[PDB]
Amino acid sequence: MEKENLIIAGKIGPEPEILANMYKLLIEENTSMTATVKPNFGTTSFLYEALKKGDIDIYPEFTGTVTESLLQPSPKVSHEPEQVYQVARDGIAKQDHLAYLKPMSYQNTYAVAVPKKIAQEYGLKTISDLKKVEGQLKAGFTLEFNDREDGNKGLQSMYGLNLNVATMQPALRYQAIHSGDIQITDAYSTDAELERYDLQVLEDDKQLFPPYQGAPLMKEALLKKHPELERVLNTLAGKITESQMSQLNYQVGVEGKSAKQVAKEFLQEQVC
Ligand SMILES: C[N+](C)(C)[C@@H](Cc1c[nH]c(=S)[nH]1)C(=O)O
């Protein structure tokens, strides 16, 4: 009786924890394997390096993050989600022999956000509009967003924006923008905090941000050993809407429910 245990990790926050718990539930129900979820395991580069080193077995990675952060050189991608997925999938298999399974439906993009009041007061609708006020407002951005070419380096290069940026921890940036310590932050578009704190996402008028859909990323060797993982995890391929994920994020991060329970009830009610 081979009862291999898979280590399923997530980036920071309730959403990767929810996803990792969905993977665990699906794997334990439909395979002979068990899984352990590692919440808040780290940021993108750490999940990626841990995956390549074998320290974790699966994590949810996002299509535009594969092409921008993980592929070297980074290919030039369009705004069509399925083509970006194919670029990410083919590229990461060739580069790192990682198998990137089929993406979920929802997009979770970086989103430059300001309080509604600020957008109204300063006449902000687009990211380009921030040039109007870059000497007046303060931004608080995660370090990873600051480090990424599709993040603050891209605000600089694509938009010529020179924001006054405080580097922030992921879990502290929304309280900072809600309290007025900052007026700009790098939201994730499925974060529950956008609605909870009456924040407005500025339109990405120059299309800095690629599409970002999540999907399981694992070593090709793991899929070869356990080919059933493809069918089992692709249960979620093309499922989960933006509104659905944002509500799950609300349940875990705002209402404090366990990610396992929230994941289980969603799968029971909406997928299986
Ligand atoms: C979903 N997302 C917005 C495209 C980001 C979110 C993220 C980046 N780093 C951490 S931690 N989370 C990503 O996963 O690359």
Numbering used by the authors: 232 to 503
Q: Which of the paper's sentences describe this entry?
A:
Here we show that spd_1642-1643 in Streptococcus pneumoniae, a Gram-positive respiratory pathogen, encodes an ET uptake ATP-binding cassette (ABC) transporter, designated EgtU. EgtUBC is predicted to contain six transmembrane helices in residues 1-230 (EgtUB), followed by the soluble, extracellular substrate-binding domain (EgtUC). The solute binding domain (SBD) of EgtU, EgtUC, binds ET with high affinity and exquisite specificity in a cleft between the two subdomains, with cation-π interactions engaging the betaine moiety and a network of water molecules that surround the thioimidazole ring.
Isothermal titration calorimetry shows that EgtUCCTT has ET binding affinity and thermodynamics that are identical to the wild-type protein. The structures are virtually identical with a pairwise heavy-atom RMSD of 0.206 Å over the common regions (residues 233–501), and we therefore use the higher resolution EgtUCCTT-ET structure to describe its features. The additional electron density found in the cleft between two domains corresponds precisely to that of L-ET, with the quaternary amine oriented toward the hinge and the bulky sulfur atom close to opening of the binding pocket. Given the short C-S bond in bound ET (1.596 Å), we conclude that it is the thione tautomer that is bound by EgtUC. As in some other subcluster F-III quaternary ammonium compound (QAC) binding proteins, notably Archaeoglobus fulgidus ProX (specific for GB), B. subtilis OpuBC (choline)42 and B. subtilis OpuCC (broad QAC substrate specificity), the aromatic residues Y341, Y419, Y443 and F293 form four sides of a pentagon and contribute cation-π interactions, while the base of the pentagon is formed by N339. The carboxyl group of ET makes electrostatic interactions with K242, T296 and R379. The thioimidazole moiety of ET protrudes from the pentagonal cage toward the opening of the ET binding cleft, with the imidazole ring aligned roughly parallel to the domain interface. A string of highly ordered, high occupancy water molecules appears to surround the thioimidazole ring, making close contacts with the thione S and imidazole Nε2, while also bridging conserved tyrosines Y419 and Y341 from each of the two domains.
